[PDB]
Amino acid sequence: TTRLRKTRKRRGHVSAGYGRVGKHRKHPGGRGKAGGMHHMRINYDKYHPGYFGKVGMRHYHLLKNQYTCPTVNVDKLWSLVPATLEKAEQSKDKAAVIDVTKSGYFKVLGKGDLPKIPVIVKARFFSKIAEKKIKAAGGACVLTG
Amino acid sequence: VSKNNVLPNVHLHKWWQRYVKTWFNQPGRKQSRRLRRQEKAAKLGVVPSGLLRPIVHPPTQRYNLKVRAGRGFTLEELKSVGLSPRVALSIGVAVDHRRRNRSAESLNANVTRLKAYLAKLVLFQRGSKAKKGLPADTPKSQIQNVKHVKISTAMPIKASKRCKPRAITAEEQKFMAYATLRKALRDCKNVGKHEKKLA
Amino acid sequence: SGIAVGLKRGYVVTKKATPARSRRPRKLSPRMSSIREIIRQVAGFAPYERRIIELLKIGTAATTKRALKFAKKRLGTHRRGKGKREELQNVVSAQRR
Amino acid sequence: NKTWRRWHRKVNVTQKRHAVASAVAATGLPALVMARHRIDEVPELPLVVSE
Amino acid sequence: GAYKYLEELWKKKQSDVLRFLLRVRTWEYRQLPAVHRCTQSTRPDKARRLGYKKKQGFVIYRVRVRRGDRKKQVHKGIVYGKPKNQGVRKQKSTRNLRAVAEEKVRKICGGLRVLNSYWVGQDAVYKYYEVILVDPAHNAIRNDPRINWLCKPVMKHRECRGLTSAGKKYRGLRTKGSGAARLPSRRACWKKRQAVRLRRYR
RNA sequence: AGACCUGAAAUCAGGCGAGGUUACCCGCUGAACUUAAGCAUAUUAUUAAGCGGAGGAGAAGAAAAUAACUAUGAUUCCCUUAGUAACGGCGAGUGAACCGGGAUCAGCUCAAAGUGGAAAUCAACUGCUCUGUUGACUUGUAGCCUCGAG
RNA sequence: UUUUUUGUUCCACGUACGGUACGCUUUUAUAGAGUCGCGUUCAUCGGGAUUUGAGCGCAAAAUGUGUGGUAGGUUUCACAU
């Protein structure tokens, strides 16, 4: 769609949309991020604060997977495993076990609220709040590794 | 640089027009691969294509749950079933002489996988007469083999899910799984710091 | 079972005890003693070794320390130097008798 | 004109399917078929025949 | 076996036995021409280990390479350009003198095909290598299977392309792992990352 | 006088090398314009030009490897990691690797020992469909062995 | 051309002088040097108290050596040969 661009309509006007006084010069103001330190400083303060300087200690050969840790919340979980819910509503004996690793998360955080059905949650890590909420539900906590 | 945009970060300062790789071949490449898979399997016909590969847990902690296909089996694993490492490439089993078995569990997975494969395996006589060993010579009884199956598709690897729903025991509700983890961290930091305070 | 963090960490699995592999300990042997104790008599010691051997013939932990300074300068690592004076200490032990 | 001018579009698979359904719907209705053919002697739409 | 005793006392370079014997040899070598033939191996110990075999059509040349570095090759050390590049004296060159020696022996022995090289001594102004060569036309090499691989037309001038032992060291295929991640080839790896990959659906 | 050792000669007998081509490939050698709104480090670029060498492909290749996991397992290529870790008048700019998903899959052999009841080996020239005569070779040619063990 | 297949096609009929596997047990004949490595100089790298290379000087070891992305020592562990 060259059709739809402004040059087509703009054609026939001498300036070509850039203005007669100032002109479309090749490179006013430098190239790229050049001039950030001096002439383009006002733009940097605001828009991009914190751009200049170094802060934290550097990590050589940082490797992801060492630190990876995908997190599910307590408010979910149920979405994790609909039939069991109708099983574990009833009975008051046994409980629907949620291995959180098998869906593919390691940590559990209790941001949400959960129905009061006894359940067992197995995850590599548990947030402090998640444990309190799960216990209230009558659920149990199990660690894998 | 004007207005509120991202500060630009483009890597085109070198003579990049020389080294532009385009992908107009992509369908022509598909169909050239695909012609030589077929023309391979014309020569084989009865014989299945690739060769059998083991079940293998990936290394680091974020792919530790998953299972994939490996490179090849193990000199320990083939000793249990009783193949030579020498002969196994004729039948179509990969040997990998580097990979150990540290666990008993990873051993007994691949030994089951090998024994199930050698149950599948019909092996023709070289002619004229039958000859035992070197599984066996199958006689001219001979149940109908289908043609090349491909070996991966014949004996595939399915993230086997599910848990048995369980009674909540005593010492399940009691033990506090934040504080159990939170000890285990702060012990493992202060190991040498403990052994001063102990002694 | 098991736990992610700690000294006793990881997935609970029945460990196998793997067989003895390469990685077979490269000991000196009674044949290859007799190779080198010949060639020690034929070749002799190098000039840098002689200066270490006289510094250990003095005794005295002042000038014994300077053997380790010398043999770290000369063979360029501490592990290389510790090994060399420990060998040539064993030469001086035999030579004194 | 360089060769690397991007010639092809990826359309989404769902929008591709919705489109084919809509196009197949227009196979029925002699409104849309007459509008876009000669359907004077044709007994029915959609014109099915045996195997 | 006698070859074990030879390698063990060749390790003792500083000793009076070998330092006498290596001072006499390095004299002899600097009277003779730069690339000239020896009729048998000085170190039969060492050559045997590098796949020398004393049958017909194997040969062995000496070579001598001047010690030290070369200047940058400019008239009166007048460089033209930015002060980084004004560096005449302390240049180094990429390639070891063992590999240079194999290279010198392209013109003198165009027909012969280089196998390997080894150090035979050194001097302040020189440094001496014995280069193991082969005749690929000869039937003793051509018939036998274990060095028939050298008679293929791919293995021409493998000194010049850096595919000896010593050539393969300066390229840095002798290390491998994270250190050598950078250099299939230094240039080949460089081409791969630099290319703008424009897949047909974008 | 005769054994070697070393070095020559020959239009000796029979062989091999040289030069050409540029799209891709291997090795050396090596800039500046340009960017930084100046400029010198940096950038352009480990690029162009220069000098060598190949092949239908080339190089790479069966770990003196990754890792720190329930561990993986030659090499190459694709996708991804990632415009990330890191480098940088920490300015301008630069910038990989492991894991993961695919194409493709193939492993091996010399030196380090052992024929010593016996050079079993190899080449050249001649002779019938594999003998003979010279030489190479014990300053080591066959067989055996290559860490997955032997 | 199927024997010499850029990985194996059909029936018919063959064989052990040799040579190679496999099981148990015993085991030390044992693995590449002016090379590795280190100190310095110069180039190169994302590789930073050195990624890789090169010159010069020093120059190893055998329950050893190399690597484990911060220089250093003591004590372990893992991985490669």
Q: How deeply is B78 buried, as exposed, middle or buried, from its count of CB atoms within 10 A (0-12, 13-18, 19+)?
A: buried
- Is-contact E183 E172, C-beta < 8 A? yes
End-to-end Cα separation, chain E, in angstroms? 69
| Residue type present at position A107 | K
**Nearest CA of chain D to the CA of E200: how many Å?**
6
Angle (nearest 5°) at CA B122 between B118 and B126: 120
Provide the 10 A C-beta neighbour count for residue E112. 19
Residue E183 is classified by DSSP as: -
B56-59 contacts at long range (C-beta below 8 A, 24 or more positions apart) = B56/B99, B56/B106, B57/B106
Please state whether strand F lies within 7 Å of residue B123 at its CB atom: no
Q: Which nucleotides in chain F lie less than 7 Å from some protein C-beta?
A: 5-7, 15-18, 25-33, 35-37, 40-47, 52-56, 58-61, 63-87, 90-114, 122-124, 135-142, 147-149
Residues 116-155 of E with CB under 7 A from strand F: 135-140, 143-144, 146, 153-154
- Is-contact A71 A109, C-beta < 8 A? yes
Instruction: Provide the resolution (angstroms).
Output: 3.2
Please state whether strand G lies within 7 Å of residue C75 at its CB atom: yes
Residue B8 is classified by DSSP as: P
Nearest to A44 by CA among A33, A32, A36: A36
Cα separation of E183 and E199, whole Å?
26
- Structure-determination approach: cryo-EM
Q: Which stretches of chain C are assigned E, i.e. beta strand?
A: none
Cα separation of A62 and C87, whole Å?
42
| Residue type present at position E2 | A
Please state whether strand F lies within 7 Å of residue A85 at its CB atom: no
Give buried/exposed letters for C75-90 (b at 16+ CB in 10 A, else e): eeeeeebeebbeebee
| Helix ranges (DSSP H) in chain E | 2-10, 16-29, 44-49, 97-104, 139-143, 165-171, 186-192
Cα separation of B99 and B87, whole Å?
18
Cα separation of E136 and E151, whole Å?
5
Retrieve residue E114's tokens: 């280089």
Angle (nearest 5°) at CA C89 between C83 and C94: 135
Nearest to B101 by CA among B59, B56, B69, B61: B56
Residue B79 is classified by DSSP as: H
CA dihedral C75, C77, C78, C81 (to 10 degrees): -20
Cα separation of B155 and B113, whole Å?
8
User: For residue B23, which nucleotide's C1' is closest to its Cα?
Assistant: F78
| 3-class secondary structure, E131 | strand
